[PDB]
Symmetry: D2
Subunit: 334 residues, 4 copies
């Protein structure tokens, strides 16, 4: 229904595309990339992590054709030149990684679009949303440049929401054992971050994350109560959050796991899942939820310090929330 | 001086050997595997993780020859048939992973050996020692079957001891992001642990660890205060401990780090180390210390909750401690 | 209709089961594995390479319940005590890798099975068959212990036949760049093959193969004409055969590719495949055919020497052939 | 004594530096890299593939200090502005991979350098040199812009020479099972070559190589007689050349190997090596020769079709050859 345009046809850009194909409410009519249609059609058809796309893909001139629909393929390095308005695009997904500042992201609006969803933490954005935690704070009038936050923040926020409301989080540290991303290096090569400068598939690479501090933008109550780090490991996709926290009310594994299970079956259904199976990272590849509690790993010490471990396919889960936010925004009035 | 024999020439058995070539106090006189000397020689000479052994290694008859020294090669499934006494073996490193219970390890004593060091967490052992922490508890008269604990416990106990004495741990949780071991499966196969049954090099595998609570054996004061889990990831060697503890005092990163830095250059020298460089797992391959604090990762919330991350070569560090333990015990009198 | 029993529920045994779920002509009624039903049900449901089973799996007592049908689980180490005839088993897929010699494979016949299909090269078998190549040489009266050859031979024979019938192979060499299998070690440990003894996911490991010479069994004319080797690399599944041969006729890349494409759409349809896309191994994980020509890699020098490269998912393609054989056998008259 | 400058401080640049430390004839006095002195010292100190550098590496101002010797650090995107002349730099190693046409490389000479060695195949270079094969064709007057060829070409030419001079090569094919390099993608992303566009550590990736044809540049009698392909696989370093050739003279496995062993011990000593041990790729990491014959893999069919497999550390072997070339050139007067 609502026309959408994607800027930056990379891992997130192509994954939001795949997720958007089976969504009746949105319609991607134009993509922007810094490469030819043929290369784009090839990368969309074949995926090393997600397999072949369940649709017929072809190239008509400089345009792609997916399941009969022709997709306009642009090659504008400068956002203000995209001309979204002329082709009817109401919402633009900004996933290049270059326009995270509201100043830069707003150019899409100069170009004619009505709303911009930055697929990453932003700077000066009108609002940051985490489907399931604060999408209710969205106002169609005061918010145009929106951030969907990071994949880590999307996994952590839903369950921190439940533990906090139910027992009260006093403070806590987190660690995400994350698969490698395109921001790293294949072999030792220059990087602003000396850890990420190192061969990705060869080591356990400790790095920084702002996802912990970022939860506060969606859960104000937790401001100053959380912090954490990342550890990038040799897997191509799927990551896990490991939260250790001091609760206010004394709990038991039994209690904690029931509260999460209840939320997964009720309120947060679709966003938070609950598992009592002893699965591993490969098993989570392709899951569309943002967070899945590994129930078998939940533990407590002295009734007040808990450990909760949650899985998340960083590409697929996040891509589904971008598509979800877009459909939610459209419903709010475009 | 002390003549040592090794039961089970595997990853740990072979590294204990390599570590022993160094210490002149000890002398390996025989090894027992379940294969021919030719195979043992090769595996000793070429290592996929630590490189070629720098020494003259050959096969003489059915014995190993390393830098002129003939090493006896046995192939006894039953330790009761090892006859250590015949060949004068004073101490035996039990590294098969099959005889961790007092009932099986003791067979080495029955065969003529004076002391047994179990290269793993044991059962019904006279004592469990972690060098740098409780070797002082060693009684030559009473202790004959001694456990050298696990690679993780050897990493954790040393710095936890320092945080406890200095600030007092109220309670804490840990996660060890661990390289895979021979205990896992190369491709999906049967295993007592359904997590470890999965292809080791393809996923992040949550698995339990007893190392956290096994700390109370060496630092009794900490019984019931710590707990934790493990996560096996696609790397052949080197692991990291991630400890989040609730302290009794208010501290700063500068304080916590200054404490760990003081211990490393002082009392725990050679066992505990301190690092301010932003390194990755491959950089600690070959590290002989037990624990190396990653200063750059030290974090604190409310001045009470702390995050300390420490590295350890699981094969090298651990194997050096076995050799250390063997020379200490020997010095106490055999 | 036909009742099949699988001996050894490993990588090949489980995939054969999966493939069989498709075929209604066959019906797997019993499996034998040296583990409990619960572990078999887990390993069957979650696969690190092939994903989750698209079927409802559960355990009822000591049995497997899959899609309502109850599968009998056995735990007999000795084939003699399997009593296949007691349970109606007509065909037995021998996939343990321990009974490839006639003396052991036949024990199934003696236990009541009418036919045995060995999922690997055999010794003293009645006939070695590669579907599409020589299945017509199957005499239901004379043949009871049948070998289905190796995954490699299965990949090479269908197109080696075509190149030969059309151009005539003088002599040729082949190398298969193969994924690692459960026969290798995760870390340096004992093995009869000192190459396969090394850390699987860390090196390119040359090893031997009999596939090249084994083509002679299904294509008698090529005896003494081919030979080859293997190179095990750090990928979990999917391999590729690289053939270099001298031909009788002087050809061109279009001629060679045209003949290979023709067979793909004709005689060898379903067994041999043709591809002109620039794909990679991960793209072939899941392919049911035995061989797929990477057309873009075909090369010729002097018009007489040719290079052909063919892909094969060593687990899926082979397991589909096993089920294809079981079905062809049943139809011939059991 | 011959002052050398390295243009481009990556895998080859840093490795030429390390090799250079062991050479008496040359002395690296300056390095141009598009990054700060701090980042370069870190990347030079810690290598994920070759380990820690055994030398004191520090940074004084914008310069590097390695074992008391200071190195000038530059950050010039444009070669013309490097001013090699002002600092006594005679030879310049061009290892950026950007300036391979004689036209671009020559900018170095304009900037004061006297000689340029391109660490890669070039376009219009004055001469291409494979040490041990044709360095005698170098002329100090007429050749100023020299190409050192590719790592694959340096591995193949030394033994191609021996096989040709000894038995006569009619024609042949080769495949190099090659480790990945910085030209590949961490995760599916754009690239000229759609195969190198795919996640490097996840698949067996076929690709093209001009190494076979390039042998004709240094071995003219071999023009149009060889061709081949490459296959990138999940290993960070060490590669192997698989050569299948039709010989002129009838031979035997023994003659071929005795021939390669002889060259290894004689004329090609230092360039070609001979191994009768069943090793794996990790065992060749750090190897300084250009090519090591895996003797156990030599195969012959109809006494005419041979197969030789040779190992090469694409970074170390090649880097040493660059240092040898630079020193060879220097001995010829500058
Ligand atoms: N990779 C993940 O796991 C993940 C998950 C959640 C969020 N993100 C965020 O998504 C964004 C993109 O990340 P990714 O991982 O998909 O990376 P990627 O490198 O695969 O995607 C970037 C794409 O944008 C394109 N591009 C860059 N600048 C452009 C420009 N100026 N004009 C047009 N196209 C441009 C690039 O060519 C590329 O195709 C980042 O902000 C990232 O942090 C990544
Ligand atoms: N590898 C590590 O990181 C590590 C670290 C610390 C402690 N450990 C412990 O050390 C033990 C050995 O572990 P590993 O990782 O070296 O494994 P491994 O599999 O490499 O070593 C086991 C060796 O013992 C041999 N063996 C088995 N039974 C034997 C017998 N009955 N008699 C003689 N030899 C026999 C096996 O063939 C193998 O060679 C385990 O208990 C393990 O928990 C391992
Ligand atoms: N995996 C492939 O790529 C592939 C392809 C073609 C042929 N093969 C052949 O398939 C056979 C199986 O190979 P795999 O890769 O599946 O191995 P695998 O190790 O995964 O499975 C073999 C199974 O046999 C079981 N087993 C062992 N002894 C048994 C016994 N006596 N009775 C019952 N069960 C027993 C084991 O528990 C194991 O689960 C081998 O002969 C192999 O050569 C493998
Ligand atoms: N990687 C190997 O195994 C290998 C082996 C033999 C030959 N080569 C060749 O050597 C060359 C370098 O390859 P590499 O593997 O070192 O890759 P790399 O990416 O590690 O090295 C390239 C370096 O040059 C720098 N650079 C780029 N433009 C520059 C410029 N304009 N001025 C100054 N510095 C610049 C880059 O920042 C980078 O550090 C290539 O041509 C490659 O084909 C590579």
């Amino acid at each position: 229904a609502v026309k959408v345009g994607i800027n930056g046809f990379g891992r997130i850009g192509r994954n939001v595309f795949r997720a958007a194909l089976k969504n009746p409410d949105i319609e991607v009519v134009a993509v922007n990339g810094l490469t030819d249609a043929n290369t784009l059609a090839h990368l969309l058809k074949y995926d090393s992590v997600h397999g072949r796309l369940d649709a017929e893909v072809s190239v008509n001139g400089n345009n792609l054709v997916v399941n009969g629909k022709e997709i306009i393929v642009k090659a504008e390095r400068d956002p203000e030149n995209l001309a979204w308005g002329e082709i009817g695009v109401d919402i633009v997904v900004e996933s290049t990684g270059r326009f995270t500042k509201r100043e830069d992201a707003a150019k899409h609006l100069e170009a004619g679009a009505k709303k911009v969803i930055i697929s990453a933490p932003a700077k000066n954005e009108d609002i940051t949303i985490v489907m399931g935690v604060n999408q209710d704070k969205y106002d169609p009038k005061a918010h145009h440049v929106i951030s969907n936050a990071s994949c880590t923040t999307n996994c952590l926020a839903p369950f921190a929401k439940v533990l906090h409301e139910q027992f009260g989080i006093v403070r806590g540290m987190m660690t995400t054992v994350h698969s490698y991303t395109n921001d790293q290096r294949i072999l030792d090569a220059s990087h602003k971050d000396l850890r990420r400068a190192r061969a990705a598939a060869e080591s356990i690479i400790p790095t920084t994350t702002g996802a912990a501090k970022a939860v506060a933008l969606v859960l104000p109550e937790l401001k100053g109560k959380l912090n954490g780090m990342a550890m990038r490991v040799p897997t191509p996709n799927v990551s896990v959050v490991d939260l250790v926290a001091e609760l206010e009310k004394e709990v038991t594994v039994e209690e904690v796991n029931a509260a999460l299970k209840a939320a997964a079956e009720g309120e947060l259904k679709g966003i938070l899942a609950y598992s009592e199976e002893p699965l591993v990272s490969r098993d989570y590849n392709g899951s569309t939820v943002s967070s899945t509690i590994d129930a078998l790993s939940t533990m407590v010490i002295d009734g007040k310090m808990v450990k909760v471990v949650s899985w998340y396919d960083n590409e697929t889960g996040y891509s589904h929330r971008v598509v979800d936010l877009a459909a939610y925004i459209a419903s709010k009035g475009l």
